[PDB]
Amino acid sequence: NPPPPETSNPNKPKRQTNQLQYLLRVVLKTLWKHQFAWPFQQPVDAVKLNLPDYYKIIKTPMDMGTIKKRLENNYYWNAQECIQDFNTMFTNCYIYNKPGDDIVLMAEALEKLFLQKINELPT
C-alpha cells in the first residue's frame, strides 16, 4: 500500500468558511450514513482486498475518511477544493472499474446524492 493522502500540511494555508462547515456537517456526514457509503469511508486497502493492481491504476486516490479528516483539520482553502476531492473519489471508482459493476452502482448513487446536497450551499 502507498501512504494515505495527507490530512494536514503545515506549509499549506488553512481556512474555515460557512460552506466548508456545511460540507462536513451536512454533506459528508449525511453521505456517510448511506447504505452504499462503506466502500468509500477509508483509503482502499489493496493488500487486504487483494487488489494489487489498484494503485497501479489509481494515482490520485481519495476517500471520504481522508476528506472527513481534512475538513476537521481545516485543511481546505475553500469549498471547491473539497468538492474536487469528492469528484476525484467518484471518478477513481469509474476508472478502476466497469459500467454496471456493483461498486460503480454504489458510487453512481452516492454521486447523485452528493450533487443534490451541494446544489445550493450557504452564502
Ligand X SMILES: CCN(CC)CCOc1ccc2c(c1)C=C1c3c(ccc(OC)c3O2)C(=O)N1C
Q: By CB under 6 A, name the binding residues for ligand X.
A: 38-39, 41-42, 44, 49, 93, 96-97, 103
Q: How many Å apart are CA 1 and CA 65, to the nearest integer? A: 16
Minimum distance from residue 108 beta carbon to ligand X (Å): 12
Q: Which is nearer to ligand X, 44 or 79 (CB)?
A: 44
Q: What's the grid cell of residue 3?
A: 501512504
Minimum distance from residue 31 beta carbon to ligand X (Å): 14
Q: How many Å apart are CA 38 and CA 53, to the nearest integer? A: 21
Minimum distance from residue 80 beta carbon to ligand X (Å): 23
Q: Which is nearer to ligand X, 19 or 54 (CB)?
A: 54
Q: Which is nearer to ligand X, 28 or 93 (CB)?
A: 93
Whole-number Cα distances in Å, 55 to 2, 33, 42, 46, 96: 8, 27, 15, 8, 9
Q: Which is nearer to ligand X, 110 or 118 (CB)?
A: 110
Whole-number Cα distances in Å, 76 to 42, 71, 95: 19, 7, 25
Minimum distance from residue 75 beta carbon to ligand X (Å): 21
DSSP strands (E only) in 22-74: none
